[PDB]
A paper describes a structure:
The Rv1018c (glmU) gene product of Mycobacterium tuberculosis is an N-acetylglucosamine-l-phosphate uridyltransferase (GlmU). GlmU, a bifunctional enzyme, catalyzes the final two steps (reactions 1 and 2 below) in the de novo biosynthesis of UDP-GlcNAc from acetyl-CoA, glucosamine-1-phosphate and UTP, While the N-terminal domain of GlmU catalyzes uridyltransferase activity (reaction 2 above), acetyltransferase activity (reaction 1 above) at the C-terminal domain requires the formation of a bio­logical trimer. GlmU consists of two domains: an N-terminal uridyltransferase domain with an α/β-like fold and a C-terminal acetyltransferase domain that forms a left-handed parallel β-helix structure (LβH) with the shape of an equilateral triangular prism consisting of ten turns.
GlmU crystals in the ligand-free state were grown in VDX plates (Hampton Research) by the hanging-drop vapour-diffusion method at 277 K against 1 ml reservoir solution consisting of 25 mM MES pH 6.5, 1.8 M ammonium sulfate, 5% glycerol, 5 mM MgCl2. The crystals belonged to the cubic space group I432, with unit-cell parameters a = b = c = 285.7 Å, and contained one molecule per asymmetric unit. The GlmU crystals belonged to space group I432 (No. 211) and contained one molecule per asymmetric unit with a solvent content of ∼82%. With one molecule per asymmetric unit, the monomers from three neighbouring asymmetric units related by the crystal threefold formed a biological trimer. Although GlmU consists of 495 amino acids, a model could only be built for residues 1–472. The extended C-­terminus present in M. tuberculosis GlmU was not well defined in the electron-density map. The residues 149–150, 154–158, 164–177 and 200–206 that are part of the N-terminal active site are not well defined in the electron-density maps as the active site is devoid of bound ligands. The biological trimer found in the current structure of GlmU is similar to that in the GlmU homologues, except that the active-site residues 398–403 are disordered. Therefore, it appears that the tail-to-tail arrangement of trimers in the cubic form results in a sparse packing in the cubic crystal form of GlmU.
Numbering used by the authors:
A (entry chain A), B (entry chain A), C (entry chain A): 1 to 145, 152 to 165, 167, 179 to 198, 208 to 397, 405 to 473
The structure:
Amino acid sequence: MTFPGDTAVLVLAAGPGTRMRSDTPKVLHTLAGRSMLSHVLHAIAKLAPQRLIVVLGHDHQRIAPLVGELADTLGRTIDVALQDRPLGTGHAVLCGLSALPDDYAGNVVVTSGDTPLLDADTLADLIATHRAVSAAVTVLTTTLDRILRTQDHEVMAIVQEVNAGVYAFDIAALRSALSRLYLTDVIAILRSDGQTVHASHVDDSALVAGVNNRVQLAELASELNRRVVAAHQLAGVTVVDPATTWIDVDVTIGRDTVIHPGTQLLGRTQIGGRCVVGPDTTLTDVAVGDGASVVRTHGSSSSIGDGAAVGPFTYLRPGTALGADGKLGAFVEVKNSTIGTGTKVPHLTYVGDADIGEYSNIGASSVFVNRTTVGSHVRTGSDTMFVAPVTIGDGAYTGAGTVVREDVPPGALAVSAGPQRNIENWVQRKRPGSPAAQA
Amino acid sequence: MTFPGDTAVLVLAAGPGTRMRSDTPKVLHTLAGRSMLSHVLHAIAKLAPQRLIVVLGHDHQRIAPLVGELADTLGRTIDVALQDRPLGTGHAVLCGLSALPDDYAGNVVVTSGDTPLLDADTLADLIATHRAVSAAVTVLTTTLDRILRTQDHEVMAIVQEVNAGVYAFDIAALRSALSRLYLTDVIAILRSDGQTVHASHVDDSALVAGVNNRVQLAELASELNRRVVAAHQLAGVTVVDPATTWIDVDVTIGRDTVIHPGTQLLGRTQIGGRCVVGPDTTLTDVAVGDGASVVRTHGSSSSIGDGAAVGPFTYLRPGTALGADGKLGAFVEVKNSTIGTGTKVPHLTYVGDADIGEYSNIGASSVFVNRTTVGSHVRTGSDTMFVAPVTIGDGAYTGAGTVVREDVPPGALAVSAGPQRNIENWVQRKRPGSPAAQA
Amino acid sequence: MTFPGDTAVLVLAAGPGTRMRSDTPKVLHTLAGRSMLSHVLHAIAKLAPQRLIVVLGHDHQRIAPLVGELADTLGRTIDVALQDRPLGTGHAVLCGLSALPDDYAGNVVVTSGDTPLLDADTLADLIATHRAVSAAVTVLTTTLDRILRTQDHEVMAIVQEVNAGVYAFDIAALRSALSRLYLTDVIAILRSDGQTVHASHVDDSALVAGVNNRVQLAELASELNRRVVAAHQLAGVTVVDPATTWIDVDVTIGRDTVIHPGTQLLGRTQIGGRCVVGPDTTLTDVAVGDGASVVRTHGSSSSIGDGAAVGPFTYLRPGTALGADGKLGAFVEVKNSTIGTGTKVPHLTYVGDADIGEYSNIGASSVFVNRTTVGSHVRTGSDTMFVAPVTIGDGAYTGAGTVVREDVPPGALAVSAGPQRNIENWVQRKRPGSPAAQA
């Protein structure tokens, strides 16, 4: 388990986000599963400090996901700080210290909300470097392709090798420096006082990269995804095209699985072992069993059994539950319906609010009109209209082109189709030409 | 407004295009909306010179889009020059001067047709540099990863830092040099005469890049698209994957919109504000209202209302007009049909040549056979066959599995479905086994 | 024709593949059409040596595709070597020499099975370099962004410019060095003996790149595909997005064809001239005629005629045979069925195990239930159920919503649909409100 000593972490999410050009606040923008605020707060919760406070601008819209949805899921209390007037980064940290007690002793960690790739390891290295030299200020730094340097390689100040914006302060030195505006000046005053100033270098520049516009958001969204796709490949996932395959956080994929280009695994998608995920597939919070094929499928909040063939051209809606060895073929839509083990729903069908038994069959061009219940080993005919509610017994049959409105007994044929009538030489009388010649 | 002084621009599109390996001429190849000829002529029309002439090889196929479709849209007359025999670039410019009067005074700008990324700003900088030093010849140059240089950094000649192929001549010097073969020799003779030769450097190398093969066409097609996608992101468009998102010229996207990977916005596509464009979506000349969702849709020449849900698995055909809050669900095809405000067409449907009123409903597995008119607040049943023409009154109903051939009165049920008949113990007699046990 | 002198090639595919994290052996992993073993053995068969032997670890699963499927297709006998205990690369080559006669005279070529991009040209250059200097050992080398060097630029030894792992030995020197463990030591002993050691440099580093994990497999899968897509573009294929377009080996594309992003041409796909391949299209072993449009199609083992419109939203299954000018529209599924010349199957249809004549028409929302035969110039109505077997004569008709069970005579109407019945003011009595007001 990874954890620091006595530390307090301040999150700075008080920026207006004018460069984003959005009505929805900058820090609440989602990438690869979670929002930018969620990415920062999760990394700090991994190490778990003594205090965690977030500074906010327009707070009321941001105070809903924070504390309510974030702190309750993580399992620890997070405080909220309010900035009165946007003056600078130094004033924002001062507003974060107001929630902290006046007689606090532990270290202060300064972090930004618009840094989604910042993980626990980078934050743990900052605190470890801070304790080693016993410095008043420890700053994370990285190299690019704005840290000022003298002549004999020493740290001085920052002039928008580069400054990341992530800091580690001693509260005894931070309170004294802010009393005498930007946060970059705090380091300059501490240097003038003769305090130890240290710079910890991060080799991976993408971790401490900030987001100002939607270009930089997509630059890091493609970056964060690249690490996840590669991590599954090393674990045992055959990804054909990593550039088009999108995998969010918490998404788990099984051993020896093939994922084809254009696939988006979103939310909390679970994939079993030896699965063939086809091209152009979108899944969100969908559980997939072992050996199941998911080709060309648009799924959301669904469950697929072991060795089940889903697709192509399948649309799944919240509440879909396909069993083992069950088949969902082409042009099939399922909404809030439970499908049994070995049941095949192949051609041009819609199953809405229904329960189907084991090893049954649904006829082509059949729809469930809106609870309907179908038994086991039931072969329903093609173009079968289901007017809810209908209870079908086990082992029953249905004719081709049958409108079912009432209950069907176990082992009984349901028919309403009109018998075929042929009129010879009708084309020769009705049609003057075209398909009439020759007959 | 941007405009030069007294200038005449010559476009060189007389190349055979053997490297392209195409029956269709090189310069007529389209990328990101417009053709290569259209990209060049639009950039020159932005600044608008006194004269514009295009030199052509096989003219008759190229003279149709030029003058007829190009000059009429821009609003200014363009002349056509014909090359008798492909001798070189110097002879091609001489053929361009033949359309110009013998007593012309203004400057001559030389440009190539196979340079699609060449914009107005690069051409405006060339003329401004040409007027400043009062040079006889001004040439655009760029750096690569074939300009000849002496020893004290001076311009001499060109030996297939690099030559772009875009020139600015003084007509008094151009007419005199061509009288005494390639266009690169003209600069060499002017240098020997003692005339001022100037080179204007372009920092962006992609702007003056030429196309010889279909590889270079795709290299610049991915380049031109990269700038457009990024421009929308800075404006206020959340693009998930810029590499798979294709946006043509004239295509406008609204504020705070989400576009998912695999989306192609082609032609003159318009997107409103706060729209959710789903994965694998193709739209060409389709107008989309504010807050509308377009997921997994193949659209061409259509209109989508405000807050309307289109998709997934929807195919739109020229003449489709969906109103506000209207829903086009899964596996739906619409051809030349007007759909009212709040009308839902959800499952496995085809609406061809029909007019539907406000807040109506279309049953699942129903098709419009080929003008049909549906009223407002009309709930048509599932598997409803529409034999054109049918006029349905406001507030009417239709049964499940009904073939409608005649007009339906306002507030009237249309039924032709056969009633359900159940035969008990049919499976036990007809089938020897399988679903018979147990019943 | 390219061919070496007297040479024997040993393939080393005895690695366990623990880094792959797969139940299926490393060398049997497929990329861009063929497996890694198939890619190596095809390149050696192009030049065709006197002897070819493959060393294996767990042989019984790998001995099935090898010799049986590989040697029979190429047309020459390949031997199988078995490794008793994984000791090293030097022991693996010694196990390869056991299949060779004790009095063999020709050269020995050492190659790895996990090198898919290794072509015939790289192997031909190795043997040509080996014969020129008459060296005992000739090794292929490349530059990266582990060959040991002295001071005056000479070859010594290898310390996991770089070592590729591909060798060329003289059998008189190879047998003597292995008698006195890794294969890298063999070069070191030969250098100590005073034998000539030569290094042939390969400018293209991707050719001799090895695969250990699924990341490197995808790194070379995207690399190999990039060369193929570019090769078609130079030949005469307009590819919009090369990054998303996947083209396997043996796949041939015609002249002046347009391929849209998200297309996967797999197996032995054939494309005619002037074809428009739409976005999100997957084809495997599918033949496409000249001028045919394949948009948004999931095809496998099918045939498309000249100038035939397939798509969008079409799913093709093994046995599909569409003729010339035939149309397969939106939401159509075809399984093991022959479709005639000029036959249109447009909306929401399934054609399973059927034969349709020339210039016929299939109604919307119609399915073929399971051999069915349809004649020429036959216009079947919408929602037509086909209960196999049904023989339809030439020029026959079918009503809208007709269940066909028996044979239809040439030029005869088939009807089973119930006539429309209208009940006026039904909504006013049955429904208390909603669509009732106003009527």
